């Protein structure tokens, strides 16, 4: 606290309470006893635990009819209207587009859409496989996930 | 009857103005003027001004013929207190209060 450690008045003789400094947390213009520090909140996970959790959430997405394995999935032109019409023809609203070949044609025209996200098959995360309502995968992405999880 | 007459930030304490205002409670209006004329208080003149303002309001905006009129609900409730510093002995300081008072007069003809 910007301020000196000077005693405001004497220890004895005064009718007021004890006083050592103005920076103490019971005083005004000053504060927190145990102040927070810029600590790291990332906590350690094991490799086998994370891979088994990925196995468990894929085994759960199988039994909930939320996993839709399809053929080669690509858009013709870099237009969001084409991908929106293609997901409308497949009755798909809140999906996780997870492919094995991250091309520029699908990575560009999927960013403005809220419920549509395009991730790479190597850098997957559990919160997108659980949070999004459907998970549609390319067969090459299925092969890459089967190779990575092993 | 409506059209009340208040007086904000009167320069006197609420207690003595209240003791002046305890004389007139349900009395006649001309009798209230006759009481506040010869009442030897500065607060008596300061509330007689508000009473004459209420009489003028009553004969101006609403149901006149002051002959049929009664001072129903007068009340003096305290207001803000200005802070001042009065120097005293032994170096210590005391803090006197410049006290104000709100004076609301509710007059009615019925």
């Amino acid at each position: 606290v910007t301020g000196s450690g000077k005693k405001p008045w004497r220890q004895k003789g005064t009718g007021r309470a004890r006083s050592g400094s103005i920076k103490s947390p019971i005083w005004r213009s000053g504060g927190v006893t145990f102040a927070a520090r810029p600590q790291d909140h990332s906590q350690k996970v094991n490799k086998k635990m994370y891979r088994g959790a990925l196995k468990s959430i894929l085994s759960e997405l199988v039994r909930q009819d939320r996993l839709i394995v399809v053929e080669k999935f690509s858009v013709e032109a870099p237009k969001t209207k084409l991908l929106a019409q293609k997901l409308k023809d497949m009755a798909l609203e809140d999906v996780l587009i997870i492919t094995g070949e991250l091309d520029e044609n699908l990575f560009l025209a999927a960013r403005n859409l809220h419920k549509v996200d395009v991730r790479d098959a190597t850098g997957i995360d559990p919160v997108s496989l659980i949070a999004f309502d459907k998970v549609v995968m390319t067969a090459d992405a299925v092969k890459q996930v089967e190779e990575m999880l092993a | 009857m409506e059209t009340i007459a208040k007086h904000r930030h009167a320069r006197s304490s609420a207690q003595k103005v209240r003791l002046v205002a305890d004389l007139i409670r349900g009395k006649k209006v001309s009798q209230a003027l006759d009481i506040l004329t010869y009442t030897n208080k500065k607060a008596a003149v300061l509330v007689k001004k508000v009473l004459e303002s209420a009489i003028a309001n009553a004969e101006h905006n609403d149901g006149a013929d002051i002959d049929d009129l009664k001072v129903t609900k007068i009340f003096v409730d305290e207001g803000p207190s200005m802070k001042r510093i009065m120097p005293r002995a032994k170096g210590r300081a005391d803090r006197i209060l410049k006290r104000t008072s709100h004076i609301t007069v509710v007059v009615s003809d019925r």
Binding site: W9, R10, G13, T14, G15, R16 | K90, G91, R92, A93
Partner: peptide
């Protein structure tokens, strides 16, 4: 107040 004085001595009682 900025300055609180020394109090008044008491009965000796020593």
């Amino acid at each position: 107040p900025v300055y609180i004085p020394r109090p008044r001595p008491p009965h000796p009682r020593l």
